[PDB]
């Protein structure tokens, strides 16, 4: 089994800039090497036929080069759509193998999160459980802090967070924090608050509701 090794395993680049990825191989694979682009929740896409032959649909920005032990994929100008993970695989010999994969994150100018808060549904109160969610809409970078306050009391161990993949268009992340409480405990309180701390924000922003 031939083993391919890509570098870097993770990469963060500014838009409209050159991006390079290297793929070193255990044995010389000569001409036979291919490149794939895999966006999240999608099947890999053929970027480059063996050596550097373009694919019929791949932009001019996408390229490649190499022979023997070493191969290099180059993105001449990084675009918003390029946000994905890239794999290299070899076709020299069976069994076929793929690279470790290279994730490329677009480094866009910092933007502040648009925060919203949602009260639990009346239909959910009947269930006996109450879930409160705080929304952090579009924001870069991905790093963010969420604090839950119930009647100005800091809560811990009852919140779960989910983060989405980088957007194809605006290259911005999105985060959702879910606070789960029993109906019994949900109604023994008045004020619920979500505290968001981000680079875009001068001071921590809190969005709250009552009743």
């Amino acid at each position: 089994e031939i083993v391919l090794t890509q570098s870097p395993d993770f990469q963060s680049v500014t838009p409209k800039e050159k991006v390079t990825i290297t793929c070193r191989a255990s044995q010389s694979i000569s001409d036979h090497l291919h490149w794939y682009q895999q966006k999240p929740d999608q099947s890999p896409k053929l970027l480059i036929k063996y050596a550097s032959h373009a694919i019929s649909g791949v932009p001019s920005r996408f390229s490649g080069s190499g022979s023997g032990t070493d191969f290099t994929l180059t993105i001449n100008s990084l675009e918003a759509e390029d946000a994905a993970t890239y794999y290299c695989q070899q076709g020299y010999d069976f069994p076929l193998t793929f690279g470790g994969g290279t994730k490329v994150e677009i480094k866009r100018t910092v933007a502040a999160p648009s925060v919203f808060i949602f009260p639990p549904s009346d239909e959910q109160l009947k269930s006996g459980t109450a879930s409160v969610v705080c929304l952090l809409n579009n924001f870069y970078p991905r790093e963010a802090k969420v604090q839950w306050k119930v009647d100005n009391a800091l809560q811990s161990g009852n919140s779960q967070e989910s983060v989405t993949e980088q957007d194809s268009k605006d290259s911005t992340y999105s985060l959702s924090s879910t606070l789960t409480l029993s109906k019994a405990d949900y109604e023994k309180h008045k004020v619920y608050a979500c505290e968001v701390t981000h680079q875009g924000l001068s001071s921590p922003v809190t969005k709250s509701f009552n009743r």
Partner: protein, 218 residues
């Protein structure tokens, strides 16, 4: 113009046998290119399992072997995959492809997920999230459906039957303490639109065969 699609069970108990089938359309397997099975565990790299030639020839990857068998049914234009003594590691998305020539795959399947758990299936509940109370602001507001307590993944959410696709964020599910997946899908719309425009989340769940639609109103 070749297309491939994979279908099978969403969930399989451990120590059982995984069975999958890929359906080829626009080209008969009996002639031409050889056809492959590729899997990718969540947040990990792709793994090549094996292939079946048009000729009916079959070869496999040495690792994972003795568990894998590939077969085809030319009459239905299909080629199937079987994995035995399945464990938690085998949890992955599975791909259909075409070796083509020179061992590069130009055409890939949509990909189907299979998860290995002894747990049973549910059964999602769909709860609406209420949009902002400030309708006078004229700015952008946000609403969404909450999909909770289902197993296993995945679930599919769309808005207004696919009419509304812009500014929609569907968060990846997280495993709750209850042992049930849950997620929220939200979309930002102009606050002025709330009165005139109606918003509906189209939620669909294949394993439990559940299809729920929910209107979102203040």
């Amino acid at each position: 113009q070749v297309q491939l699609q994979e279908s099978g069970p969403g969930l399989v108990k451990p120590s059982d046998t995984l069975s999958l089938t890929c359906a080829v359309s626009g080209y008969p397997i009996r002639f031409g290119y050889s056809w492959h099975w590729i899997r990718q565990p969540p947040g990990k790299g792709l793994e090549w399992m094996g292939y079946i030639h048009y000729s009916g020839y079959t070869d496999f990857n040495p690792s994972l072997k003795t568990r894998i068998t590939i077969s085809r049914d030319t009459s239905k234009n299909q080629f199937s995959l079987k994995l035995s003594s399945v464990t938690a590691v085998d949890t992955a998305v599975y791909y259909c492809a075409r070796k083509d020539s020179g061992n590069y795959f130009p055409y890939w399947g949509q990909g189907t997920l299979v998860t290995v758990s002894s747990a049973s299936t549910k059964g999602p509940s769909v709860f609406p999230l209420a949009p902002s109370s400030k309708s006078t602001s004229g700015g952008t507001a946000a609403l969404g459906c909450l999909v909770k307590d289902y197993f296993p993944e995945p679930v599919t959410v769309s808005w207004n039957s696919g009419a509304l696709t812009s500014g929609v964020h569907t968060f990846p599910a997280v495993l709750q303490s209850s042992g049930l997946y849950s997620l929220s899908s939200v979309v930002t719309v102009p606050s002025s639109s709330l009165g005139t425009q109606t918003y509906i989340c189209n939620v669909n769940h294949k394993p439990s065969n559940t299809k729920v639609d929910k209107r979102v109103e203040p």
